């Protein structure tokens, strides 16, 4: 019908959603968990340091074996680092030097990279010839790539700057499913432990939950007020925390569809670049534009500890599957492993 | 000690050596960036300096390898990837001279130049300014006064004064005159006139960087 009538209907639906959310909230998380004993001060030291790159590191992902991690930098080289022995397992020479995302397959056979170029290239690490090769090149996106993360050895969800997410098939190299619910360009991606639903954060200050099989936005969250650069999924799978550029990190949940609490401090004025969760979920390690990294108490919103080992913008932060150590990457060409 | 990890360490050392060689090769090679208004003449300067996403063109001139990047096919948020180009040797900004009455286009070009020159990620990089369609501007200036675009231009309607005023207005947008350069050049149809200016600006920036590293400046 008319545009005005549809806009009025959408406004009425948004008002109804807000009323339902408000009437379904009775007690805040902070007042529920105030009775919990405080975590206390946390001290972490740089157990390992990596200095093989020669440019700005933009991404880093942890393998499922908790031993190897892949790092991406603007020099055009992807390095598979050995965490225990501080060794370079492989060096991947990129055809395009512009890379801002990388991923490691759960089986460890494949890795993915992407950046300004609209291709999320897949490299095979188990070739018979002994050298890495470009297994597939996904060239269906029209904007800059932000994050493509593996689901299996044949499927991968890619988020690009054209405000659309895609579900690529490695064997056929085609978009099985395309998600077009976002209005702003998607920046970060995260996957649930059961690998059935995923939530993505865009620059429109909104995060949307998607279904891998069906392919529509089940829920959307508009608790922020600026661009969203980081997002992570709780190990339980019923909640997720995302960063933003207004020095605020908010923890949303899926079964209530509202913001449980927010993490912020008056001293902190810079945005959040990377967000990761520990195995327990008690500690929320969030990156920031300044040289240091902060560890937040998830259930109390308290500054548990500060990781200030870097001297430039922190870009990528990750926590291994077993939670033994935390790796922090920055633009100073240095990768540090904390524990 | 180690039993089989010695070969792994040797492989890591070989990878480190290869990475150092590649990094030295990349640092020896100059890096350039292209930006400007729509249809400003980028497709013309690309043909002048003879060789989807980012388009990369590589060419060697005077024993100096050039890397040139064109970003005109990305209809996304610029500030989400403008920091990815931090550290480029120079930025080539192209504005068509015969665009002062094309509606406002010159105002948009000035806005883009002000946004890119005052950006916090390019506070030290040099800017190479190219003015294309000079012949069209000379033909149009006779019939159309420059006061249409700039109402405060109290001058003659000849090519020299108009070009000087345009150059002065474009250079006045820079509020970082302390340690920044603006190499303004007028394009020519003849070859080896634009690439020569690019090489001169590049070697000037290289001299400036070497002096800064040596501590003289």
């Amino acid at each position, epitope marked *: 019908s008319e545009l005005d009538q549809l806009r009025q209907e959408a406004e009425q639906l948004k008002n109804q959603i807000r009323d339902a959310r408000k009437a379904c909230a009775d007690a805040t998380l902070s007042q529920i968990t105030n009775n919990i004993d405080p975590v206390g001060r946390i001290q972490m030291r740089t157990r390992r340091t990596l200095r093989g790159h020669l440019a700005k590191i933009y991404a880093m992902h942890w393998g499922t074996d908790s*031993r190897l991690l892949v790092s991406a930098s603007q020099d055009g080289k992807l390095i598979i680092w050995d965490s225990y022995t501080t060794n370079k397992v492989h060096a991947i020479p990129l055809r395009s030097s512009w890379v801002m995302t990388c991923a490691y397959a759960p089986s460890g056979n494949y890795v993915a990279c992407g950046g300004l170029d609209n291709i999320c290239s897949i490299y095979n690490l188990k070739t018979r*010839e*002994g*050298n890495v090769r470009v297994s597939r090149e996904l060239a269906g996106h029209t904007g800059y790539l932000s994050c493509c993360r593996f689901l299996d050895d044949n499927q991968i969800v890619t988020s690009s700057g054209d405000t659309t997410c895609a579900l690529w098939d490695i064997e056929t190299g085609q978009q099985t499913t395309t998600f077009t619910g976002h209005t702003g360009d998607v920046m970060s991606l995260s996957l649930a432990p059961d690998t059935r639903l995923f939530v993505s954060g865009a620059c429109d200050a909104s995060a949307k939950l998607w279904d891998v099989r069906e392919g529509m936005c089940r829920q959307t969250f508009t608790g922020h007020e600026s661009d969203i650069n980081a997002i992570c999924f709780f190990p339980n799978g019923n909640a997720f925390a995302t960063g933003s550029d207004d020095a605020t990190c908010r923890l949303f949940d899926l079964r209530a569809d509202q913001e449980l609490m927010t993490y912020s401090h008056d001293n902190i004025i810079c945005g959040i670049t990377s967000v990761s969760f520990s195995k327990s979920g008690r500690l929320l390690l969030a990156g920031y534009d300044d040289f240091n990294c902060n560890v937040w108490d998830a259930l109390k919103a308290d500054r548990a500890g500060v990781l200030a080992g870097h001297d430039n913008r922190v870009s990528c932060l990750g926590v291994t599957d077993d939670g033994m150590a935390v790796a922090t990457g920055s633009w100073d060409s240095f990768l540090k492993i904390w524990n | 000690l180690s039993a089989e*990890d010695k070969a*792994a360490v*040797e492989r890591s050392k070989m990878i480190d050596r290869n990475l150092r060689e590649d990094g030295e090769k990349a640092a020896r090679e100059v890096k350039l960036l292209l930006l400007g208004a729509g249809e400003s003449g980028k497709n013309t300067i690309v043909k002048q300096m003879k060789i989807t996403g980012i388009v990369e063109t590589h060419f060697t001139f005077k024993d100096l390898h050039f890397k040139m990047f064109d970003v005109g096919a990305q209809r996304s948020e610029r500030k989400k990837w403008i920091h990815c180009f931090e550290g480029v040797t120079a930025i080539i900004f192209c504005v068509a001279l015969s665009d002062y009455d094309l509606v406002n286009r010159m105002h948009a070009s000035m806005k883009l130049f002000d946004s890119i020159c005052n950006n916090k990620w390019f506070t030290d990089t040099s800017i190479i300014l190219f003015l294309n369609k000079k012949d069209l501007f000379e033909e149009k200036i006779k019939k159309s006064p420059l006061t249409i675009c700039y109402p405060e231009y109290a001058g003659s309607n000849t090519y020299e004064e108009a070009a000087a005023y345009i150059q002065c207005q474009f250079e006045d947008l820079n509020k970082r005159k302390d340690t920044k350069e603006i190499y303004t050049h007028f394009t020519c149809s003849t070859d080896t006139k634009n690439v020569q200016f690019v090489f001169d600006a590049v070697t000037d920036v290289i001299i400036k960087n070497n002096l800064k590293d040596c501590g003289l400046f």
Partner: single-chain antibody
Amino acid sequence: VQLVESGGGLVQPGGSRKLSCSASGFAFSSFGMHWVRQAPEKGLEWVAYISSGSGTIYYADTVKGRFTISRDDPKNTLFLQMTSLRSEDTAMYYCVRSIYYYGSSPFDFWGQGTTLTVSASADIVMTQATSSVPVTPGESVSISCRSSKSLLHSNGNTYLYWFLQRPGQSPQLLIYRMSNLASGVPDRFSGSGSGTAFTLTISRLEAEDVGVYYCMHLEYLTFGAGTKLEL
């Protein structure tokens, strides 16, 4: 992945010979190489090893000084020049590729080898006993091996390898590090051990596994005596 060997033939004792290996289908520059010598009646014997960067060259106790090994990465050819040969070296040699990194499978591919005929301590010793083990198709056969020194390194990885050499065929890697199965082999093969005694088990045996099994990497690479299965 192909490894063609050349340079064999009858040679008078006390002379010199050159062995050449041609490598194709894989990145030869980033692959370490080994030379394995097998006597007409005895088992496999290690000779020499050269790394990817042509450094850290190792030789056997009875090979050091007498033999030299070099590689040509641009030519994709391995050269093994032998001088002052005697009657104890009348055996066919093998060229083995091996790349060493986390999760790698060294000694995965073995060359065809060439026959060479000559006319007239402190090292880990692998015994493995079991000279002959009669087998029946469809049954389960277990192969046991023993090592003088414990192979369980301080890093938690035990360096043990199992090789299968079918009659008139080049040896193939079955299990590396006694717990990881090599690529391209059936899953029925299994391996286990406690650092001193190692056991290789085959389930649902058929006629394609008839051959001689060899066992080995903590220090420089003695082979086992060799267990032969008779069908």
